[PDB]
Enzyme design. Structure first.
Site, PDB file in Angstrom:
ATOM      1  N   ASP A 168      52.895  21.871  45.543  1.00  0.00           N
ATOM      2  CA  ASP A 168      53.464  23.147  45.074  1.00  0.00           C
ATOM      3  C   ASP A 168      53.776  23.079  43.558  1.00  0.00           C
ATOM      4  O   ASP A 168      53.997  21.979  42.980  1.00  0.00           O
ATOM      5  CB  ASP A 168      54.710  23.531  45.914  1.00  0.00           C
ATOM      6  CG  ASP A 168      55.190  24.962  45.687  1.00  0.00           C
ATOM      7  OD1 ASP A 168      54.293  25.811  45.382  1.00  0.00           O
ATOM      8  OD2 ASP A 168      56.420  25.262  45.810  1.00  0.00           O
ATOM      9  N   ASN A 169      53.821  24.252  42.892  1.00  0.00           N
ATOM     10  CA  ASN A 169      54.421  24.389  41.541  1.00  0.00           C
ATOM     11  C   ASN A 169      53.644  23.638  40.480  1.00  0.00           C
ATOM     12  O   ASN A 169      54.264  23.098  39.515  1.00  0.00           O
ATOM     13  CB  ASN A 169      55.892  23.896  41.494  1.00  0.00           C
ATOM     14  CG  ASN A 169      56.768  24.543  42.552  1.00  0.00           C
ATOM     15  OD1 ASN A 169      57.238  23.859  43.498  1.00  0.00           O
ATOM     16  ND2 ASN A 169      56.963  25.892  42.443  1.00  0.00           N
ATOM     17  N   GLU A 198      57.580  31.867  44.049  1.00  0.00           N
ATOM     18  CA  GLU A 198      58.155  32.483  45.266  1.00  0.00           C
ATOM     19  C   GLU A 198      59.086  33.648  44.905  1.00  0.00           C
ATOM     20  O   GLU A 198      59.997  33.532  44.053  1.00  0.00           O
ATOM     21  CB  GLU A 198      58.857  31.426  46.173  1.00  0.00           C
ATOM     22  CG  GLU A 198      59.888  30.552  45.425  1.00  0.00           C
ATOM     23  CD  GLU A 198      59.342  29.226  44.944  1.00  0.00           C
ATOM     24  OE1 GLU A 198      58.155  29.131  44.554  1.00  0.00           O
ATOM     25  OE2 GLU A 198      60.117  28.203  45.018  1.00  0.00           O
TER      26      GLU A 198
HETATM   27  O1  LIG Z   1      62.661  26.285  39.360  1.00  0.00           O
HETATM   28  N1  LIG Z   1      61.885  26.750  40.149  1.00  0.00           N
HETATM   29  O2  LIG Z   1      61.397  27.889  40.031  1.00  0.00           O
HETATM   30  C1  LIG Z   1      61.395  25.905  41.261  1.00  0.00           C
HETATM   31  C2  LIG Z   1      60.493  26.428  42.208  1.00  0.00           C
HETATM   32  C3  LIG Z   1      60.037  25.590  43.215  1.00  0.00           C
HETATM   33  O3  LIG Z   1      59.178  26.039  44.224  1.00  0.00           O
HETATM   34  C4  LIG Z   1      60.432  24.228  43.304  1.00  0.00           C
HETATM   35  O4  LIG Z   1      59.889  23.498  44.264  1.00  0.00           O
HETATM   36  C5  LIG Z   1      61.384  23.746  42.312  1.00  0.00           C
HETATM   37  N2  LIG Z   1      61.886  22.387  42.312  1.00  0.00           N
HETATM   38  O5  LIG Z   1      61.593  21.605  43.237  1.00  0.00           O
HETATM   39  O6  LIG Z   1      62.558  22.012  41.340  1.00  0.00           O
HETATM   40  C6  LIG Z   1      61.828  24.583  41.299  1.00  0.00           C
HETATM   41 MG   LIG Z   2      58.269  24.460  45.292  1.00  0.00          MG
END
Ligand SMILES: O=[N+]([O-])c1cc(O)c(O)c([N+](=O)[O-])c1
Ligand SMILES: [Mg+2]
Ligand SMILES: C[S@@+](CC[C@H](N)C(=O)[O-])C[C@H]1O[C@@H](n2cnc3c(N)ncnc32)[C@H](O)[C@@H]1O
Length: 214
Positions: A168-169, A198
């Site tokens: 993801d990301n 998301e």
């Molecule tokens: O900061 N964000 O938008 C996210 C989004 C995400 O989907 C993450 O998984 C995240 N994280 O694990 O730090 C941070």
């Molecule tokens: Mg994520």
């Protein structure tokens, strides 16, 4: 309801149908998009996760980073009887929410939740959890762990030809060191899936990296 994570769980318990995974996912996504944003993979990127699972049909799946259990419920509802999802979560308060969410959604018999850091648990998976090799890994913990944990999975003998890594990301917040490694290495065959952050309209994406052997 003292924390955001408790409030997400309480919304599910009051509005979703016990034993119904789809109902749990829809209650989380509605609450988070409209009332309190939270870092679940969510409904749009979740359709990409679903498609990867449907195509590759894993029997032994590892998740790095559980949070409130959204992605564990989403993936478990697609697995066959006798499949195993092992999910690792460093924070005890999030782990307690995840187990309640998994129980309520009706998927507990497919899920093994482990409280601890990914880099401590990964070397124990063969001897303590009876893993041979993994069919798929969902990477969604802190992004500075993606590359070191991918190297550790390989060093511990947990990847086979055809093991799917799905991260993801890879755009937002980003995982550039992981991406440069898998895309440049002859040991992985990579596919990029562009989407959105998301619940929002910032551009994001996932990377699928299929292991080709050492
Ligand atoms: O900061 N964000 O938008 C996210 C989004 C995400 O989907 C993450 O998984 C995240 N994280 O694990 O730090 C941070
Ligand atoms: Mg994520
Ligand atoms: C983005 S959230 C996981 C969201 C979940 N995959 C979903 O889509 O519903 C990231 C999680 O990784 C956990 N985490 C961070 N570093 C970790 C590590 N080294 N091992 C395990 N969990 C970790 C955090 O505590 C947090 O709950």
């Amino acid at each position: 309801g003292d924390t955001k994570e408790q409030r997400i769980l309480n919304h599910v318990l009051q509005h979703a149908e016990p034993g119904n995974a789809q109902s749990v996912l829809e209650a989380i996504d509605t609450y988070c998009e409209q009332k309190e944003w939270a870092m679940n993979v969510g409904d749009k990127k979740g359709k990409i996760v679903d498609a990867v699972i449907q195509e590759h049909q894993p029997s032994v799946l590892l998740e790095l980073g559980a949070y409130c259990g959204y992605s564990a419920v989403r993936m478990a509802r697609l697995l066959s009887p006798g499949a195993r999802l092992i999910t690792i979560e460093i924070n005890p308060d999030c782990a307690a929410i995840t187990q309640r969410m998994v129980d309520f959604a009706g998927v507990k018999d497919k899920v093994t939740l482990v409280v601890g850091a990914s880099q401590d648990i990964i070397p124990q998976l063969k001897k303590k959890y009876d893993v041979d090799t993994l069919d798929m890994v969902f990477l969604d913990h802190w992004k500075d762990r993606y590359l070191p944990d991918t190297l550790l999975l390989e060093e511990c003998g947990l990847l086979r030809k055809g093991t799917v890594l799905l991260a993801d990301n890879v755009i937002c917040p980003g995982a550039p060191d992981f991406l440069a490694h898998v895309r440049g290495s002859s040991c992985f065959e990579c596919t990029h899936y562009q989407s959105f952050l998301e619940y929002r309209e910032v551009v994001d994406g996932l990377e699928k990296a299929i292991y080709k052997g050492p």
